[PDB]
Amino acid sequence: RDLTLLQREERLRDLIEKQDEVLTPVVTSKDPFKDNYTTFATALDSTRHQLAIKNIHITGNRHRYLEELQKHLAITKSLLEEIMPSHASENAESFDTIKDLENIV
Amino acid sequence: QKTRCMWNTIMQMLKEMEKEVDVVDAVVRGNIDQYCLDGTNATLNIPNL
Amino acid sequence: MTGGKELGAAVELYERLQMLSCPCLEGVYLTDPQSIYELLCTPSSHRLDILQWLCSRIYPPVQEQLSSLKESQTDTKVKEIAKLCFDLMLCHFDDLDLIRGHASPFKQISFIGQLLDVIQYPDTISSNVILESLSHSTEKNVVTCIRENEELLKELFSSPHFQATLSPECNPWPADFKPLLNAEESLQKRATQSSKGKDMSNSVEALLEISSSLKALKEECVDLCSSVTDGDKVIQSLRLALTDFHQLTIAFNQIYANEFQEHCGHPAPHMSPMGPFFQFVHQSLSTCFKELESIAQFTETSENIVDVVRERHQSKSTLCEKMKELRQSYEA
Amino acid sequence: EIKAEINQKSLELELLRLEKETADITHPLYLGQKHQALQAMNSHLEAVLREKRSLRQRLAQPVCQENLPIEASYHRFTAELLPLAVNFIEKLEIYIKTIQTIPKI
């Protein structure tokens, strides 16, 4: 028993020291890498918060163009609120079940 | 318990950064500029009604 | 405990009573050791008339004497059986309660075994020698047995071994065990302090608990029972991946400070609440588009099916005609 | 001889208790999961350290006043709404006939 348990805690400490040597460098490098990398990530994502445009007519400042487009999408959503029945999805999902019924018939 | 603590300090960092990873990776393999507001082909035919 | 050996020995004597063809078992097909033990060990006529058959097998002149004694003379049968068993060197002549069945079962068992032993087995069934005149058989059998006994005693007593059998001693034990075997007043204390029928039970009891605990731990540790033999390669790959992660982390910090941090100081673009509005207006306009496409499809498909089934009825004879022409042939 | 089976089962139960507790730092399953997390992060960082040339050339572009300031999640819906609005304005004289056939259903 005792000579087999000793040989198990022997190999446990060997398997630990072979990791500890390599974990300690990585841990001493942790947060000074993390916070540089997070500063880089948020700054890099700001370069993608910027939709591309081709041959749209636009008048002055891009916020002032969005302000006037907003005043008209504030009529388009309000008109889908004047047009969407409580079953618009069930109707829109039936589309191809109707065609497979016809294909079977 | 020290080797467990160092493993948790590292494996928790890989889950702290879990958003920042695919957010940096998004420029390394490129889901960007994919959709463009393009009027060049929008030759709208207004109906008689 | 205890009586399990008296139950087992009652089955030995009962199977031997069947082998020796006891007529007092004809149809008495017991298969329960308790019922078999009670048939051999309880106060019954069934058992007393078995003891009378055993006595008649060993000494036939008692069979006339015990058949002259009635049911109402059973306590006289008991005394002539005890008096026969005393003359036969089996019990005392007043040992009446061994003969009745009130003695301890091991005494009854030991007595019935010493009857069944003397009833030699029928191995060479010499069919005719059952009832030819006993009065001109017995004296021959006595003289032949006296002769066998003179020969056997004279040739037992010619052996040099004939005082060792009568005074036996044995020692397998070599010198390297005799220090233990001389330690009598110390070690025999332990050998008398063991509680035996307890110690045996608690040993199996602890073996079952530890076996259950070891089973449950193995039914929990199933992933750890998986034979992932390549452990040193996993440890080597893990150590490499930590070493490469540290290098790539150091390379990132160097490249950030020389190539990114100059540009990471930019202020972010002020957002617009228009994103969710572009999503809602796209999605509900797309559902309204599909809804009216599907209502159009439903009307078109419903009228197409109402034309196709009409042509199947009316195009030609028609199916609906020729199937009834065919039918009415077999109805005829 | 029962003692031999008791004591040998006790030693196996003790060895399996030790393996059970050390498993996250000794057992190749959890060491393999720790390896996969590091190897995935390395297969990201090796590609960041290559593409640093592209990453710098995107960070070096100041916030584009010819683009639209919109979060990247909304870019598809923003771009497709122009084609979808045109197609809906053109289908308009078909949809009005569909609504006039709703009474058939």
TrEMBL record, chain B:
Q: Which residues form the signal peptide?
A: none
The domain of life is Eukaryota
**What is the official name of this protein in its record?**
HAUS augmin like complex subunit 6 L homeolog
Q: Which organism is it from?
A: Xenopus laevis
TrEMBL record, chain C:
Q: What Gene Ontology terms for biological process does this UniProt record contain?
A: microtubule organizing center organization; spindle assembly
| GO CC term (a single one) | HAUS complex
Signal peptide extent: none
Q: Which GO terms describe its molecular function?
A: microtubule minus-end binding
User: What's the name of the protein?
Assistant: HAUS augmin like complex subunit 7 S homeolog
Organism of origin is Xenopus laevis (African clawed frog)
The record lists the lineage as: Eukaryota, Metazoa, Chordata, Craniata, Vertebrata
UniProtKB/TrEMBL annotation, chain D:
Q: Which residues form a coiled coil?
A: 1-58
Q: What cellular-component terms does GO give this entry? A: centrosome; HAUS complex; mitotic spindle microtubule
In the record, biological process GO terms are: centrosome cycle; microtubule nucleation; spindle assembly
UniProt entry keywords in alphabetical sequence: Coiled coil
Q: Which domain of life is it from?
A: Eukaryota
**Name of the protein described by the UniProt record:** HAUS augmin like complex subunit 2 L homeolog
Classification from the root reads: Eukaryota, Metazoa, Chordata, Craniata, Vertebrata
What's the encoding gene here? haus2.L
Which region of the full protein is contained in this chain? 54 to 158 of 222
